[PDB]
């Protein structure tokens, strides 16, 4: 009866920490990407009859 478990075998645990690892990376990479924001000032046409 030296098994670790019938349900939580060592093979399942090694596969669930690696998934946890690759998913931790992914969730970070999608935080950097969401915070992208476009620089709208250099695209719009703005003119003023005061300065020009």
């Amino acid at each position: 009866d030296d098994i670790l478990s019938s349900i939580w075998t060592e093979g399942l645990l090694m596969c669930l920490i690696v998934s946890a690892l690759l998913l931790f990376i992914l969730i970070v990479a999608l935080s950097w990407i969401s915070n992208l924001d476009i620089t709208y000032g250099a695209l719009e046409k703005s003119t003023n009859p005061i300065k020009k």
Partner: protein, 159 residues
């Protein structure tokens, strides 16, 4: 089926093959979009610099060709009955090139976005960006070298 050839063993190869193109694609997108918005801002007033400032957009496309090269080599080392030695090799290869190219990619975006904006204001500042940007494209490479060293040891003397 055996102590040395379980049935969950290919899981680490397939997940490694996938994660090499996933992590390198994300990097080359952050660095294409970010860079790509500076090009769409400077070339409203200086359209003559368009073809010269796509160089950041090139460097990130090479980050993606590396991750494709590792997915192609680990895929042909897969099998229903392979050792657990082989599976973790296939993992570390994808985790190396992927995590390395993701990081290189983001730097290409941040530095390439600034260079295109500056070189419009200072044409002597183009070569300065071409230098800084090669030291990012070479970090995706240093991850590729590790993946290749490991793959060699994959099915060597396995039984």
């Amino acid at each position: 089926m055996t102590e040395l050839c379980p049935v969950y063993a290919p899981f680490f190869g397939a997940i490694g093959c996938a994660s090499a193109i996933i992590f390198t694609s994300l990097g080359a997108a952050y660095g294409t979009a970010k860079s790509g918005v500076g090009i769409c801002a400077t070339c409203v007033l200086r359209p003559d610099l368009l073809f010269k400032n796509i160089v950041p957009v090139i460097m990130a496309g090479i980050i993606a060709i590396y991750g494709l090269v590792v997915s192609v080599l680990v895929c042909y080392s897969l099998g229903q009955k392979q050792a657990l030695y082989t599976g973790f090799i296939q993992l570390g290869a994808g985790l190396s090139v992927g995590l390395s190219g993701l990081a290189a990619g983001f730097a290409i975006g941040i530095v390439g976005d600034a260079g295109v904006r500056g070189s419009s204001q200072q044409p002597r500042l183009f070569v300065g960006m071409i230098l800084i940007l090669i030291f990012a494209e070479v970090l995706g490479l240093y991850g590729l070298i590790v993946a290749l060293l490991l793959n060699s040891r994959a099915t060597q003397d396995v039984v």
